[model samples]
Target: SMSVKKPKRDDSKDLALCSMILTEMETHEDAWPFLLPVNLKLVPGYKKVIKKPMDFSTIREKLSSGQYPNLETFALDVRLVFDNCETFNEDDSDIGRAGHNMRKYFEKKWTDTFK
Candidate 1:
């Protein structure tokens, strides 16, 4: 079930996630919709996993040879990491309820997560 309640976060985490997604755009276009900030933590535990660092470079090299070859693949890689959010801690105090609320509305109305 989809909940209107947004994913909570602090300023630092907010900026970090935003930067990560923006960077991931070059690799995970389809997954972008699912991420749409508003739909991010809505899934359950994803809000935590995304907080980690990027690990695509190594994986991409193993997959082929050149730099990330394409954007879709990048998105896939990011999705794989985010899909495993439960592995992270729920101590992201950098976030707050207001940020969470604003995030959902942003995604639902502008980001287009459900579609």
Candidate 2:
């Protein structure tokens, strides 16, 4: 009699890589705008424009809490941060430029590491 085989998926390597990438992003010079959650008090219109806000600190907490099931999911949140920035800030503005820079850096790092 043959017993049923369970599917095995090991994400330890991916998880570690994600953490490393996140650390690099946090330390990046243009990371100031994405470091924390946007303050609603300062920008009351933020909530209205950005339906789902994401930041580096929130990503860090999620990674630490094991909320990401796969690398793709982790990447989603990172991308969200940049997307939101683009939506709320003007392209020529400092914060907008930082967002673009950060996104480029992250994409390069991600491709180099994963691909």
Candidate 3:
């Protein structure tokens, strides 16, 4: 019972936004061992949400190729990766917070297109 929406402009902005989201996840120590950890507390499955299982590059490629279809699908997909991790007390997790903030950022700047 949810409506889907695509990016109004399939350009650098979208690409960069997706990339940034991936980067944030990728750079997390839990997500990437080599990367510097940026959390008050570590969360399990952070790596899964960041790469390999989640496959950040795959999402990037899909977005780059415009296979995401719409903003709704894209956002949900990205959100799911973070939501899967069992950390930050439900929606209060770092990834959860990131997802919320990033989604809001896209909605205000890109998804809504202008509002």
Candidate 4:
């Protein structure tokens, strides 16, 4: 007798969408400060203030390595980058402005693609 197998949920399409968004973010002009982890030595007290530090490079690595379970998890990391930036920098500061701009771009892309 032949046995039937259950279908498994596929996240490949969502993963691809995430990769595209990440690539777009990586190339954005305001992406400089968020491209990599903050240099703790250069930015004194950053580690202490920002409880969770996230960046584009880390997100890319996680996505490429299949670390994110789904698109929601990937989005959390992306949002964390901006959240940490706001926690560490003043709203009117250059880095702060960049964070706002990048966040806006990400949100718009997310909405356009997913919603």
TM-score, cand. 1: 0.25
Tens-digit lDDT string for candidate 2 (1-115): 2786777666669989999999999999999999999998899799888999999999999999989989999999999999999999999999999999999999999999888
The candidate maximizing lDDT is 2
Q: What is the TM-score of each candidate against the true structure?
A: 0.25, 0.90, 0.39, 0.88
**For candidate 1, lDDT tens digit of each residue in 1-115?**
3677667533333333433444444244233322334344465655554564334343334344534444445445544443333234232422233233333443453244213
lDDT of 4 by residue, 44-93 (tens): 89878888889999999999998998889999999999999898889999
Model 4: weakest 10-residue lDDT segment is 1-10
What TM-score does candidate 4 get on C-alpha atoms?
0.88
Clash totals, every prediction: 8, 0, 4, 0
Q: What is the full ranking by lDDT, best candidate first? A: 2, 4, 3, 1
Candidate 3 lDDT over residue span 1-115, tens digit each: 2587675554546556666665665565445322233332465555555442334555666777878865567666665544443333356766556555554544454344422
Candidate 4 regions exceeding 4 Å error are 1-11
Error of 4 at 56 (Å): 0.3
TM value for model 2 = 0.90
Residue pairs with backbone overlap in model 2:
none
Q: Each model's C-alpha lDDT?
A: 0.40, 0.95, 0.52, 0.92
Residue 7, model 4: lDDT of 82
Which pairs clash inside model 1? 9-94, 9-95, 10-94, 10-95, 27-71, 27-74, 27-75, 28-75
lDDT agreement of model 4 with the native: 0.92
